[PDB]
């Protein structure tokens, strides 16, 4: 809505808010990111450190699919199965532990942030972090790898 903007309030005011002395001129200071190493150096250094220069090795023909490895933490691990699955295992008399296939849920690597409920579980993943494996074995579970 143009009726809600400053232009409707700047009618009758000669400089339209831009000022009498400095005026409103086309491009004082340059166009775009002009003078980032010259007359705009302080802004670029103050707010965008690292902007200028090369770092690291380039890699031609990067294929993002090859590096595809979504991760899930242990605190969210039991959300990949139904609530029926986890209550049944807890009240199960035997040592039967449910299987959580994180690849089926869309994750490849299991990370170890958080803590697990005290009940065994079999976790199937492409990759495991060291601490995720340790926490799964602490609750009596097992980690088995898939390809």
């Amino acid at each position: 809505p143009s009726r809600l903007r400053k232009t409707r309030k700047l009618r009758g005011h000669v400089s339209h808010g831009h000022g009498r002395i400095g005026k409103h001129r086309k491009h004082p200071g340059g166009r775009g990111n002009a003078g980032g190493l010259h007359h705009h150096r302080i802004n670029f250094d103050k707010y965008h450190p690292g902007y200028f220069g090369k770092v690291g090795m380039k890699h031609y023909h990067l294929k993002r699919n090859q590096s595809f490895c979504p991760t899930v933490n242990l605190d969210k691990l039991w959300t990949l199965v139904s609530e029926q699955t986890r209550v049944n295992a807890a009240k199960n008399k035997t040592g039967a532990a449910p299987i959580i296939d994180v690849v089926r849920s869309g994750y490849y690597k299991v990370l170890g942030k958080g803590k697990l409920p005290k009940q065994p579980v079999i976790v199937k993943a492409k990759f495991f972090s060291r601490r995720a494996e340790e926490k799964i074995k602490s609750v009596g579970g097992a980690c088995v790898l898939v390809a």
């Binding site: 340059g30 002009a34 699919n65 039967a96 065994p120 079999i122 494996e133």
Partner: protein
């Protein structure tokens, strides 16, 4: 000019963009026009499925999608051979065939041939001359059961095997998943250089005594 904190922006509007702008005011009209063509095509092939030929079961290529199965271009010639369908007859009865697809594994080959055999059973074939049926189908079921199928023929369906909760064995509990992955990466990384060093030691052993 930069003003305080902000994101260094690089708009790509230096190239006279206003002369090549694609508006979408014909999008509602385009959706109507394609839908008329879809309906007209379905009427033209009256009993044949509206979507078209049956397509094969296909696993997606890369490591991002290789857990997912989709529909492919056409059944392979190897798939048709063990299904007993001529590669020139199949296209006349609604089987799409891709001459340039090979079957690297038997499971993919064997899954697609059950798709073909099962589709062959579901197929109702009208005789070329309705008065004289040679080997088409019985008129009892080709009359009443003949209906234009809507949607893809036998839609490709991602099936998940449900794993039964079981007791964890001690062997499973003793497996070191993280150590195995770290050792496997090292073994694959140093396989070539280990063979060279073993070879260079072998050349030292064949001449250790002189």
């Amino acid at each position: 000019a930069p003003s305080r904190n902000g994101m260094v922006l690089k708009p790509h509007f230096h190239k006279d963009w206003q002369r090549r702008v694609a508006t979408w005011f014909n999008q509602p009209a385009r959706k109507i026009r394609r839908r008329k063509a879809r309906q007209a095509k379905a009427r033209r092939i009256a009993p044949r499925p509206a979507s078209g030929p049956i397509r094969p079961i296909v696993r997606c290529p890369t490591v991002r999608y290789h857990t997912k199965v989709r529909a492919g271009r056409g059944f392979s010639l190897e798939e048709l051979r063990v299904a007993g369908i001529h590669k020139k007859v199949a296209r006349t009865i609604g089987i799409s065939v891709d001459p340039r697809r090979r079957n690297k594994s038997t499971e993919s080959l064997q899954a697609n041939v059950q798709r073909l055999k099962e589709y062959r059973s579901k197929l109702i074939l009208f005789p070329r001359k309705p008065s004289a049926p040679k080997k088409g189908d019985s008129s009892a079921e080709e009359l009443k059961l003949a209906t234009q199928l809507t949607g893809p023929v036998m839609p490709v369906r991602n099936v998940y095997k449900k794993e039964k909760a079981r007791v964890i064995t001690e062997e499973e509990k003793n497996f070191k998943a993280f150590a195995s992955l770290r050792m496997a990466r090292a073994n694959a990384r140093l396989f070539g250089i280990r063979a060279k060093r073993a070879k260079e030691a072998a050349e030292q052993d064949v001449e250790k005594k002189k």
